[PDB]
Each structure stands twice: as C-alpha cells, then as structure tokens.
Design a protein around this ligand. Structure first.
Ligand SMILES: Cc1cc2nc3c(=O)[nH]c(=O)nc-3n(C[C@H](O)[C@H](O)[C@H](O)COP(=O)(O)OP(=O)(O)OC[C@H]3O[C@@H](n4cnc5c(N)ncnc54)[C@H](O)[C@@H]3O)c2cc1C
Length: 451
C-alpha cells in the first residue's frame, strides 16, 4: 500500500476498538484502497474492521432514480462484506451526529473515510472532527493518482494536468491486493428504501399521463453489474469508441459513469483492464483520456477551487468576456420549468433533456450541447449555472459529482477551455451550433428516439 494514498484529517488518541471505515464515495468491496487501508490498520492493531454508511438527510434533494440505484447497490454490498466477515452499519441521519455517536458507542479505535472534494463531504467532515477524539484519515480510493499528489494546484488545461498525471502513472497504476477477511466474525435496507421512496413519491417525475418518466432497466445497479458493463464495453464497444464517442445516436460509450459515481466499480480497475486489452489504436487513447485526464482533473478542479460551482471559478478571460456580454439581449429566455420539461424551441435540446428524463444518463456529447444552450437562453451566467446544476443533480444517475460541476463549468464558463471567436451573449465561450451537430451525427434520429 502506497502511503501517499492516505492523508490525516485530524490527529487524535487511538482507541482500542475496531477500525471504522466511513464509506461514502466508494461503495464497493473490491478494488477499494480506503477499505484495504482500513483493513490493514485493523490488522496492525489486532482488531476488526467495520464499515459504516450514513443515509443522510439530503436524499430528498434528488430522486427515486438515484436513491434506488444507490440502495440496491448497498444491499448487494452487505452480502459481499459479510462474506469477508466485515460487518456493515447504515446510519439514518447526517454524519456529524451519527458517526461521532457510532465512534463512542462502539469504542472505535481509528476512523477512515474515502475522498470526495465536494462541499457537502467537507461539511460532514468538519462536524465529525468536532465530535471525535480518535485519529481520522482519508484515503483517495476514486483516483488512480491521489488528488493531492497529482498536482499541488488547480490546472487550467488538460494539457498542463496530463503530463503531471502521466508522470505518476508508473508509480500509482498498480494491481490491487485481495481484501483479507476479518479473522473472526465480531431496519433492513428494504424498509429504509420503502420509507425513503414514500417521502420522494410526491416529487417523482411523471408524464402528463401520471406514468413515471424514468426507465430503470438501462443500468442495473451493483458491483457485479458494473463489472459486466465494463466487460461488455471492452469486448463490444472499446474498438469503435474513438470513432463513435461523439455520436449520441449510437450506444457506444462505456456506460460506466453511474457505477463510477457511487464507486460500485474502481476506475483504477477499468484502466487496468483497458490497458491490457488489445483494441483499435486510437480508441484506447481516447477512452483513457476521459477516465484518467478528464475525470481526475474534475477532482483537481473541485479540490483546489472552493467556488467550483460559481462564476468566480471561471478563468479570467471568460469572466471578462461573459461580463462584456451580460447586457446583450438573449434571443430566448426559458424558465427552469420550461427547461425541465424539454419545452424550448430547440428540438435537439428538448430531445437531450428527454434522454436525461427517461434514462438518467444523457449522452456525453449532447451534455456539452445542453449546458451551452442553458447559458444562451438564461438571464445571466450565474442563473445558467444554477439551472444546469439543478437539472444535472436532480436527473443524472451520475450527478452530484465533481465531473458534473467541472463539466458544467467547462460548458458555461470555459473552465479547462480556451477563448473561441467572440459572439454576442455567450462571448468567447466555445459555441456548439445546432447546424454543427447536424454535420456531426444524425440529429433527426436522436430526436426521434427521445420524443
Ligand atoms: C454539462 C455536463 C455535465 C456533466 N455531468 C456529469 C455528471 O454529473 N457526472 C459525471 O460522472 N460526468 C458528468 N459529465 C461528464 C461526461 O458527460 C460523463 O461522465 C459521461 O457522459 C458518462 O458516460 P460514460 O460513462 O458512458 O462515458 P465514457 O465516454 O465511457 O467515459 C468513461 C468515464 O470517463 C469519465 N469522463 C468521461 N467524460 C468526462 C468528462 N467530460 N469529464 C469528466 N469525466 C469524464 C467518466 O467517469 C466516465 O464514466 C458531464 C459533462 C458535461 C458536458
């Protein structure tokens, strides 16, 4: 285990009870440096490792679609951890109260968590630090290169982050040891799920017919399903990925993001397996650029920019340009509700929103298109950011994620982009025209599918 993957969050006085892994972002038993590090600390302290997960109060800010995907994954995780003789505890409430109380009730010796750069995770961490007296570590289990090691700062372009990340892959891209079971064995999620579904139901996304919009069969949740999606991608989709990743009418992406978001599969795992695959040269470079460079620069962005969801984090050239065009008359303005129902005058935009509504995963190419039009048809960049985040986090299975904040900030604010030709309203932000998409893929066919 490379000690550069683990960081101290708070010194303390070690207790003599179990080591507690507060699982949050990496909801898997295999390929999990945070669990592996926790198991190892336990072994040196001659105590078991246990897993705690907090079912937080914020679940009512998203939908059934994410709550069910996540909890059906955790049901499977319970079984897997128990086979390793690792108990798991699911705490209804927010971490400050529930983790601090768990630590005390169970006499935890050491507390470990996984790494998320999101504001809510840091809020949770502050409240836990004030409720405990034992040592508290975090482990980057989501990036191949620990986020605080990849760069010491915000990287303004993929081309400045790329050479730093690739210079560290020889060290950090490595196989995973097997998780050692514990020596000995030291409200069901079903009922939790039902309680939570009851609370969510009034806000469920319904057609006018009251029929639910969401189709829950496009991505089966859990660690075992994630691995099959990974295996089918490498076998059937990787070869064509370079040619087809920008064609939303084709189903040729990996479809791994919902699994990667909740940590039901390790990206380090996916990279290991892609690296060993013999596939079309070009396709592997393209995929690895997305799952290494662009995914891990998103953690870089959220980690070094506390205002990652606000206009103030845009590059100076984009803030200046959007400000210069802030009083340009927009050709249309849409309300949040009009965006949300796909009721604009742009049928490609509406189709993209319909794909989000019905499957919980909008094709990566039309996400770019979709966020850029929110900029073009809202009162201001700040309002555009709020609308894009709202809809992305409400309806994307892979939402509430650094990739999301960074992808929206790329779209609307030019983060990790350069200035392009000056237009009214959108200024020098990269523009993606309708006619452009028409020359790129079969727009009429995409609209047909999602209408
Ligand atoms: C406006 C906008 C919002 C986005 N919101 C999210 C979000 O909430 N959550 C999310 O996980 N991704 C987000 N993305 C990034 C990207 O669209 C998705 O990760 C991707 O479409 C998921 O499909 P896939 O797994 O089939 O992708 P693939 O093309 O197979 O890529 C494999 C993995 O690479 C990573 N990746 C790919 N593209 C990007 C990218 N542009 N930025 C960062 N990582 C990337 C993801 O982890 C993805 O699962 C957003 C992009 C934009 C433009």
């Amino acid at each position: 285990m490379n000690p550069k993957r683990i960081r101290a969050l708070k010194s303390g006085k070690q207790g003599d009870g179990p080591v507690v892994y507060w699982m949050s972002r990496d909801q898997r038993a295999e390929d999990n440096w945070a669990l592996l590090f926790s198991r190892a600390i336990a072994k040196e302290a001659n105590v078991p490792v246990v897993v705690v997960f907090c079912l937080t109060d914020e679940f009512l800010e998203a939908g059934i679609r994410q709550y069910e995907f996540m909890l059906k994954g955790l049901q499977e995780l319970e079984v897997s951890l128990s086979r390793k003789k690792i108990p798991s505890f699911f705490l209804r409430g927010d971490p400050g109260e529930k983790i601090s109380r768990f630590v005390k009730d169970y006499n935890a010796g050491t507390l470990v968590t996984d790494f998320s750069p999101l504001r809510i995770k840091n809020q949770w961490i502050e409240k836990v630090i004030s409720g405990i007296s034992i040592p508290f570590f975090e482990v980057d289990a989501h990036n191949v290169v620990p986020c605080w090691e990849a760069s010491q700062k915000h990287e303004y372009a993929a081309h400045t982050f790329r050479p730093k990340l690739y210079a560290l892959l020889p060290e950090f891209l490595e196989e995973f040891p097997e998780l050692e079971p514990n020596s000995v064995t030291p409200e069901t999620l079903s009922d939790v799920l039902e309680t939570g579904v009851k609370a969510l139901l009034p806000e469920r996304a319904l057609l006018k017919n009251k029929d639910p919009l969401f189709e829950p069969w496009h991505f089966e949740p859990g660690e075992k399903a994630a691995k099959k999606v990974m295996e089918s991608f490498i076998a059937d989709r990787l070869d064509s990925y370079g040619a087809l990743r920008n064609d939303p009418t084709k189903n040729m992406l990996s479809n791994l993001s919902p699994y990667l978001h909740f940590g039901q599969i390790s990206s380090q795992r996916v990279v290991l397996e892609v690296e060993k695959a013999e596939s079309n040269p070009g396709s592997k470079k393209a995929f690895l650029d997305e799952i290494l460079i662009w995914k891990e620069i998103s953690d870089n962005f959220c980690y070094y920019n506390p205002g990652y969801d606000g206009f103030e984090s845009f590059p100076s050239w984009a803030k200046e340009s959007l400000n210069a065009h802030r009083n340009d008359v927009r050709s249309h303005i849409y309300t949040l509700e009009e965006f949300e129902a796909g009721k604009t005058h742009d049928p490609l935009w509406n189709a993209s929103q319909m794909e989000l509504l019905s499957t919980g995963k909008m094709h990566g190419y039309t996400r770019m298109y979709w966020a850029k039009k929110i900029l073009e048809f809202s009162e201001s960049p700040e309002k555009a950011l709020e609308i894009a985040i709202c809809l992305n986090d409400r309806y994307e299975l892979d939402g509430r994620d650094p990739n999301g904040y960074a992808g929206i900030a790329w779209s609307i604010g030019g983060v990790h982009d350069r200035a392009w030709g000056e237009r009214e309203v959108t200024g020098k932000i990269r523009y993606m025209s309708y006619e452009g998409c028409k020359r790129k893929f079969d727009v009429k066919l995409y609209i047909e599918k999602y209408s």
